[PDB]
Amino acid sequence: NFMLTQPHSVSESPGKTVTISCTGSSGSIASNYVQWYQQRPGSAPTTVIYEDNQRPSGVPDRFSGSIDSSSNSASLTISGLKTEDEADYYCQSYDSSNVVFGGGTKLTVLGQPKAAPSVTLFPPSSEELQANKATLVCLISDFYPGAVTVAWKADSSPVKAGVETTTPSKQSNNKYAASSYLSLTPEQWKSHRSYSCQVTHEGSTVEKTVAPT
Amino acid sequence: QVQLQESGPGLVKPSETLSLTCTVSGGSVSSGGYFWSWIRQPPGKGLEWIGCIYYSGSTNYNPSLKSRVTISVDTSKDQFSLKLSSVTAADTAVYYCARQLWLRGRFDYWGQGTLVTVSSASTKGPSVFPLAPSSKSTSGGTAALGCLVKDYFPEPVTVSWNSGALTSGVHTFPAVLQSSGLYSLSSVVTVPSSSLGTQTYICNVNHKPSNTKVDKKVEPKSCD
Amino acid sequence: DEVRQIAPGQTGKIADYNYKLPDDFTGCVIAWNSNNLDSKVGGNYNYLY
Amino acid sequence: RLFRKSNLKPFERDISTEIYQAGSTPCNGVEGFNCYFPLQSYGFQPTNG
């Protein structure tokens, strides 16, 4: 029943010194060796310290660890915070033939201004039509803030049935991206004269329209 | 040096048997007197220790995962495999095969993490539809084109443009749950409108769970 | 008022915190007034202690 | 307020915006070398823990 208690969210500006703790509940923190792992998202974790005070060959000297055995807490001191230091931190233990990991620490970035919400509309394909399906796809990209409201329209009537939209996600150029999908029947696609998707972003509205051609 | 590579299918149905094998190149399983260990990590959660093995029959397992982890070592093939029983939807985690220098020490080398998804009901392949650009699809000197992935099960699906040759402007959106079980997403790329009728754009949608690879060409819309 | 402090065998505020003078001091100290160049109107505060 | 010269009596409000004697050097009235501002911003965010 031995678990390592770790702060879930720790934030610090670059260039300063921060301390990450790892507290054991039942067993003392000096009983077994504690290993800290720094893992980038979408990659394998990498060992950054070992034996509670020894830095492996490759990591910078700033990854310094200290043991406060009186409080049963393992400490990892980080000095000179930089951009690539933003990663998941986990502390390891062993207990008694049962390796126990830590809760996890995420270092935040503490950065983009308002961006124009480019909108693209795609009519249902001919290949989708013989499959007895139809889909209207609305595209929202290169925008900020990441809060856009979508509203489909059938000529003039708003459409809510079959509407599926995506939460905004950050792009590579620090902007956001989103999508909206409108499931429809082939008969309903040709029943209305035209369809349109309206995107509201910071008051401004960007509207495109599609027609069965 | 030494490298550890995982294999096996990326899917397993609930209440079934998992079979993932981790292979070793550049080293020997029996030599050196070290250990092997399997460690999993759910998306957005911390690392979880599954079990550790020796090149002999010595095994130890997590008491939360006891009586469900079966790991074996075959020295002839220079690899080792883990078998999991009674897998549920809460077992969706990225599985890491890490070499362990010291039993209570650190995992010096970590293999790349394969993604494992568990979800009830049968696996459903994707339906890829072309997304034809047109005059309404361009805003200025640039246009947009893409492909639609609809009614597939389960995550994930990867979309590559021109077999990965086109990466600039490619936006792969996260999936959303449809009104009836299945997922839906799209992957689009921004292109200047001058090369619309002179360049061929083919999207490569792969569904490893359903073992379906679909190549769909993207062409400008023709009025009918 | 601190030029009398540059000597071996006394305790003060500058001779013990900035430059200590030992007993075996065979130095040769020179000082003079050049207030027309190192100081200016409005308060010259460039030097510290 | 992060920086202060000395302690304060209980039930007292401190609204002084004077630059704390961080290094007690002339800094032309800004918070440069050996000068820091006592008042600092927060790090509030709705997505924290």
Task: Give one DSSP letter per residue of chain B, joined into a string.
Answer: --EEEE-S-SB--TTSEEEEEEEEESS-SSTTS-EEEEEEE-TTS--EEEEEE-SSS-EEE-GGGTTTEEEEEETTTTEEEEEEES--GGG--EEEEEEESSTTS---EEPPPEE-B--SS--B--EEEEE---GGGB-SSEEEEEEEEEEEBSS--EEEETTTTB-TTEEEPPPEE-SSS-EEEEEEEEEEGGGTTTS-EEEEEEETTTTEEEEEEE------
Residue C17 burial by Cβ neighbours in a 10 Å radius (0-12, 13-18, 19+): exposed
The token pair that represents B127 in the structure block: 């339906």
Task: Write down which chains contact chain A via at least 3 CB pairs under 8 A.
Answer: B, D
Sequence-distant (6+) residues with CB within 8 A of A110 are A11, A12, A13, D43
Say if CB B183 and CB B205 are below 8 A apart.
no
Q: How many CB atoms lie within 10 A of CB A98?
A: 17
Resolution (angstroms) stands at: 6.3
* Amino acid, single-letter form, for residue B25: S
C-alpha B176, offset from chain centre: 17
Rounded CA gap, A188 and A210, in Å?
14
Q: Nearest chain A Cα to B169, which residue?
A: A172
Q: How many CB atoms lie within 10 A of CB B183?
A: 21
Say if CB A134 and CB A188 are below 8 A apart.
yes
Who among B60, B184, B221 is closest to A98 (CB)? B60
**Which is nearest to A101 in space by CA: A5, A10, A32, A18?**
A5
**Which is nearest to A76 in space by CA: A6, A147, A124?**
A6
**Which is nearest to C10 in space by CA: C1, D25, B150, C20?**
C20
Rounded CA gap, D22 and D36, in Å?
6
Say if CB B109 and CB B99 are below 8 A apart.
yes
- Tell me which chain A residues have a C-beta less than 8 angstroms from the C-beta of D48: 9, 11
Sequence-distant (6+) residues with CB within 8 A of C22 are C8
Q: Could you tell me if D25 lies within 8 Å of chain C, comparing CB atoms?
A: yes
Strand partners, B144: B190
* Amino acid, single-letter form, for residue D35: C
Q: How many CB atoms lie within 10 A of CB A210?
A: 21
Sequence-distant (6+) residues with CB within 8 A of A184 are A124, A134, A135, A136, A162
Rounded CA gap, A201 and A178, in Å?
12
**Which is nearest to B175 in space by CA: A165, A112, A109, C31?**
A165
Say if CB A89 and CB A77 are below 8 A apart.
no
Rounded CA gap, A48 and A58, in Å?
9
Q: What number of C-beta contacts closer than 8 Å exist between A and D?
A: 6
**CB contact (8 A) between residue A137 and residue B146:** yes
Phi, psi of C3 (to 5 degrees): -75, -25
Q: Which of residues 78-117 of A touch D (CB under 8 A)?
A: 110
Strand partners, A66: A75
Say if CB A1 and CB A63 are below 8 A apart.
no
**Are chains D and A touching, using the cut-off of 8 Å on CB pairs and a minimum of 3 such pairs?**
yes
Sequence-distant (6+) residues with CB within 8 A of A210 are A121, A122, A123, A136, A194, A195, A196, B136
Q: Which residue has the tokens 């002999």?
A: B56
The token pair that represents A36 in the structure block: 């800290």
- Tell me which chain C residues have a C-beta less than 8 angstroms from the C-beta of D26: 45-46
Rounded CA gap, A145 and A101, in Å?
37
Residue A87 burial by Cβ neighbours in a 10 Å radius (0-12, 13-18, 19+): middle
Who among A56, A121, A177 is closest to B171 (CB)? A177
Task: Write down which chains contact chain D via at least 3 CB pairs under 8 A.
Answer: A, C
Q: Please, what is the Cα angle at B11 between A91 and B172, to 5 degrees? A: 80
Cα distances from B129 to residues A70, A126, B80, B197, B210, in angstroms, run 63, 9, 41, 19, 17
Rounded CA gap, A7 and A22, in Å?
8
- Tell me which chain A residues have a C-beta less than 8 angstroms from the C-beta of D42: none
Q: How many CB atoms lie within 10 A of CB D36?
A: 15
Q: Could you tell me if A139 lies within 8 Å of chain B, comparing CB atoms?
A: yes
Q: Could you tell me if C45 lies within 8 Å of chain D, comparing CB atoms?
A: yes
- Tell me which chain D residues have a C-beta less than 8 angstroms from the C-beta of C48: 25
- Tell me which chain D residues have a C-beta less than 8 angstroms from the C-beta of A11: 43, 48
Q: Which of residues 102-131 of A touch B (CB under 8 A)?
A: 102-104, 118-128, 131
Point out residues after which chain B has a gap (C–N over 2.5 Å): none
Gap from B31 CA to chain A (nearest CA, Å): 23
Say if CB A93 and CB A27 are below 8 A apart.
yes
Sequence-distant (6+) residues with CB within 8 A of B20 are B6, B7, B8, B81, B82, B95, B114, B116
Rounded CA gap, A99 and A93, in Å?
6
Q: Which residue has the tokens 């990326």?
A: B10
End-to-end CA distance of chain A: 67
Sequence-distant (6+) residues with CB within 8 A of B131 are A122, A125, A137, B145, B146, B147, B148, B186, B188, B218
Mapped onto helix, strand or coil, the DSSP state of residue C28 is coil
Strand partners, D44: none
- Tell me which chain B residues have a C-beta less than 8 angstroms from the C-beta of A125: 129-132, 148
Interface test with D, best of A6, A10, A11 (most D CBs within 10 A): A11
Stretch (H or E) spanning A161: none
Say if CB A5 and CB A93 are below 8 A apart.
no
Say if CB C19 and CB C5 are below 8 A apart.
no
Cα distances from A87 to residues A35, A175, B31, in angstroms, run 16, 21, 34
Burial pattern B147-169, b for ≥16 Cβ within 10 A else e, equals bbbbbbbbbbbebbbeeeebeeb
